Design a binder for this molecule. Structure first.
Ligand SMILES: CC(C)CC(=O)C(=O)O
Ligand SMILES: [Mg+2]
Ligand SMILES: [Mg+2]
Lengths: 377, 382
């Protein structure tokens, strides 16, 4: 049932991804509902995006047939990889970047209620020259709001990246390490409070231009980050802690950045203990425009010659109790996490611990050897 | 030339990358002579994964004495007229770094945090903090039960900080310094962001590890650092550390053998020298024995059952300097100016020397993974 995780209009869409048909990772385009092996046009997705800039026609690759006819299976139904065809993460050589704390109104309010409320929002809004829900990060209004927050003793390093001029942008994981649709993702076995983060992921080419978008799960360990923000990397970057997919949807007549900007991202978590968590949260509340976030990651002071993928952040808060009252959500082995939006489909993974997930073994040199052996270089 | 190589470099085994005119080439320097080992393995990462530690690497193609090669630093060859160019000695490795592994750095991190990145507040905060702490941080082993009891004391003192958690708690601070293939090497320009007004070099020793997590050798490093970004918010760590040309490793990795081992890394005296167009001079020394966690312990936290690195990784071990010498205004401390020359040196590894400019004036990073792949393929090396 490969159709259940594609966008409802996928046959009218342009998808860009990676599939192993049995010889190794192959960049594919899906157009008219049919898969095209484009490896002879460009041997990687990063190379394809660099070879064909926006507005250029991408030629046809070799026909692999209707995507729904490929026997693709997820790990929880095919634990041993018996399937003849394996869908992969749609990234290969791109750097994996991630923004965080991009929904500021959420952050601000959560601090005002931790203190309580209606009375605190008066002064902050009057000093800002405006309602908090209109906060513009990096503005002069945000600057006066910062100084008012400092004067109240409510300021924090998190509000700095919420409303200051610089967004929080970090490296989510090493190149070639992402999980894809239908893979296991890993939380550290020594983390006790962790959660998914349902996100939209931008595809950017080697010229810093936004080409398309996919779904992402930024697997997150709250107990590490909460002990120290200097453990951010350890909270975000472990074996199988990144999932992107199922495909990147490229911008065309049917789909553009404006569709990303108004995308409703849904999250569902299902456990064997019969725990269920559901929730939806709209990209229109993001406090920094996706094109602005791309322009902070890429510019005169940082380039990315193979391109980069960019997680745009989330406003989902893992506060729903599971077993321990007041301590919020945490994963258990075998949880199924679905991240979905209508124009991009469904990214679904199974949760295990980083030591039980398959280790990351296929790195840059493994790809090079594989592509060399197939005559694709 | 010999000015930037180990004292005993002709007796050492050095591993690095040189562009002779056709693209990046993994080289070994033995007996003072350069070997092109590209036909043995096409990258440094591949070479470390093909030969385990202790295994003798067979001889490559002789390229003559190293001192006979016309290698020139950017401050003497701005347009790159030299026929040969020395590169960073990493290629496919992930660039990993440890933080606050020396007490002098830990204190300056708490200072810039409480200053919220404002250099004009550092003197006042340093005067308070340096006396109340100091003699405290190195009084415990990080991650021990003792360290947990010191944490409870400092919390009661009102002195606790998220930086002390990674300085003495069970988890070291490890982060990604920059993207694969983005490092600068000896003789390159490094970059501080043009919008940073409180910044510094960070001399460090850099380990080379293979794809099995084994420590293989060591180089020198400059982890160019923006204090005003990181002090404003620790969530800006990546932006404080990872910008165009903000990473320098070199001149070569020295591989472990009978002339050099991890024990030499553990006792290495490291020297920092900064010189500017304004005739500012800083010169200082510190020793690796002051590190709070053994280098093998740090590599063991970076690599294990919960994070692999199939192409290997480089690991900055943490800076042992935090420059606070006043440059222009009494009490205002240090920051870089364009044209600064930064020398990191220790006798067993040589000299890593770079010229500082702003990230936007440094040449952009254009040679990434695809460029390397295409270059190697065109040379028949795959
Ligand atoms: C938090 C980091 C700035 C600390 C660091 O890089 C170091 O101490 O070497
Ligand atoms: Mg995020
Ligand atoms: Mg450092």
């Amino acid at each position: 049932g490969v159709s259940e995780f594609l966008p409802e209009d996928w046959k009218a869409a342009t998808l860009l991804g990676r599939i192993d048909f049995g010889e190794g990772p192959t960049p594919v385009l899906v157009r008219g509902g049919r898969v095209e092996d484009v490896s002879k046009i460009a041997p990687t997705v990063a190379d394809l995006m660099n070879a064909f800039q926006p507005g250029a026609v991408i030629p046809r690759g070799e026909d692999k047939g209707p995507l729904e006819a490929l026997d693709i299976r997820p790990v929880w139904e095919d634990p041993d990889g018996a399937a003849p065809v394996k869908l992969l993460a749609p990234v290969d050589l791109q750097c994996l970047k991630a923004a965080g704390v991009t929904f500021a109104v959420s952050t601000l309010e959560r601090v005002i209620e931790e203190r309580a409320a209606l009375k605190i929002r008066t002064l902050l809004a009057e000093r800002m020259g405006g309602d908090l829900k209109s906060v513009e990060p990096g503005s002069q209004g945000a600057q006066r709001l910062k100084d008012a927050l400092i004067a109240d003793g409510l300021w924090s390093q998190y509000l700095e990246v919420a409303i200051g001029p610089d967004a929080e942008i970090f490296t989510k994981g090493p190149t070639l390490s992402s999980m894809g649709w239908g893979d296991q993702v890993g939380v550290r076995y020594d983390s006790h409070w962790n959660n998914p983060e349902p996100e939209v992921v931008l595809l950017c080419d080697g010229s810093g231009l936004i080409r398309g978008a996919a779904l992402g799960n930024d697997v997150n360990l709250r107990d590490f980050e909460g002990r120290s923000a200097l453990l951010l990397s350890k909270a975000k970057d472990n074996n199988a802690s990144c999932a992107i997919g199922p495909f990147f949807r490229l911008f065309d007549e049917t789909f553009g950045l404006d569709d990303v900007r108004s995308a409703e991202v849904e999250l569902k978590i299902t456990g064997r203990d019969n725990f269920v968590l559901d929730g939806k949260s709209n990209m229109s509340l993001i406090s920094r425009d996706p094109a602005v976030l791309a322009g902070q990651a890429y510019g005169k002071q940082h380039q990315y010659p193979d391109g980069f993928a960019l997680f745009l952040g989330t406003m989902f808060a893992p506060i729903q109790d599971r077993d321990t009252p007041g301590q919020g959500f945490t994963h258990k082995v075998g949880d199924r996490v679905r991240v979905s939006t209508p124009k991009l489909g469904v990214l679904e993974n199974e949760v295990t611990t980083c030591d039980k997930a398959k280790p990351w073994t296929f790195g840059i040199s493994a790809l090079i050897r594989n592509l060399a052996g197939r005559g694709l270089l």
